[PDB]
Amino acid sequence: LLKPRTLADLIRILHELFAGDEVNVEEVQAVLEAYESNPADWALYAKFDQYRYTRNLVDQGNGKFNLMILCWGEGHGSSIHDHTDSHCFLKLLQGNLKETLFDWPDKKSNEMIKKSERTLRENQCAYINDSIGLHRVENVSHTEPAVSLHLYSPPFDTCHAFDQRTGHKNKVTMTFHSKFGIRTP
Ligand SMILES: [Fe+3]
Numbered sequence: 484l485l486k487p488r489t490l491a492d493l494i495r496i497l498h499e500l501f502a503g504d505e506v507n508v509e510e511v512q513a514v515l516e517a518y519e520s521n522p523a524d525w526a527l528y529a530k531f532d533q534y535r536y537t538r539n540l541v542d543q544g545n546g547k548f549n550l551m552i553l554c555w556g557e558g559h560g561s562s563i564h565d566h567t568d569s570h571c572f573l574k575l576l577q578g579n580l581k582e583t584l585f586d587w588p589d590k591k592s593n594e595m596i597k598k599s600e601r602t603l604r605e606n607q608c609a610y611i612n613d614s615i616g617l618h619r620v621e622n623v624s625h626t627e628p629a630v631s632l633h634l635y636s637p638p639f640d641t642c643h644a645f646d647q648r649t650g651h652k653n654k655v656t657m658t659f660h661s662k663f664g665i666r667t668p
Contacts, residue, residue, distance in 0.1 A: 484510060486517045490524035494542050494550065497634070501547040506570055506636060508610060515634065516608040520576040527664040528552040529577075529630050535559055536622075537660035541632075548636035551659075555580065555629040560621025563595065563647060564655070565613050567639035574608040578622060578629030582609060585617035588650025595647045603631075617645060 487493035496514055500507060522529075528539045529552060536559040542550040555578070563585055573582075584598045598616060603609050611618055622629040643652040659667055 484514060487514060489521070490518065490541075493518045497542075497548070497550065498545060501544055501636065508570060511570075511572055511634070512608050512610055515572055515574045515632070516606065518574070518606075520574075520606055522577065525552055525576060525630070525632075528661070529554050530661050530666065531556055531628060532660065536561065538633075538657060540659050540662040543638070544636070546638070548634055549638045551633050551635075552576070553631045553633055554660075555622035555631070557622060557624055557626060557628060560623075561619055562655075563617050563619045563645040564642045565617055565645075566611065566635065567642050568613055569639050570634075570636045571611045572608060572634040573603065573611070573620070574632040575603050575605050576630040576632055577605060578624060578627045579604050580629050580631060581621045581623050583619045583621075584611075584615070585619070585645070585647075587613075587617060588645065592649045592651065595645060595650050 487496055500511055528541055530537055530539055531554045536553055536555040539552040541552055580603045583600045585595050588595055641654055641656050644655050645652050
């Protein structure tokens with residue numbers, strides 16, 4: 484377990500950690516957090532959109548994980564979502580994001596109430612899965628875009644969004660804005 488000097492070193496260390504069948508969550512998280520964000524490494528991937536956050540595939544981890552870069556303009560946020568029974572790691576490359584944690588609702592139609600909120604700041608790494616709960620991620624800054632590195636294992640194409648007033652959920656299909664530095668409409 485060595486320090487990733489560059490995003491390309493990190494990706495090679497991640498391939499080594501996902502060699503087996505099972506995941507060492509704490510080791511993944513330590514090494515993601517040890518990579519010092521350098522914009523020259525991931526410039527190619529930071530493709531923003533005026534209206535919402537963009538998802539930009541970086542590496543597909545020999546089928547074991549998706550590594551992607553999320554770009555969040557001012558005020559861009561996600562909905563309340565689960566992660567499809569996968570692991571989710573989230574490292575901040577630039578700016579800050581607010582994360583809000585929710586519990587799985589009851590089949591009762593009811594407002595969903597926050598368990599907790601917190602700020603994720605530059606270079607920190609957060610971890611979530613469905614057994615911890617639901618969450619919402621947002622760039623609440625009026626001035627500064629945010630960029631995060633995201634790692635999901637196993638990969639998933641879809642997830643569920645939750646309406647905060649009802650807890651009712653809807654299945655959603657992930658879109659890539661770009662793959663490997665190349666935009667894809
Ligand atoms: Fe998420």
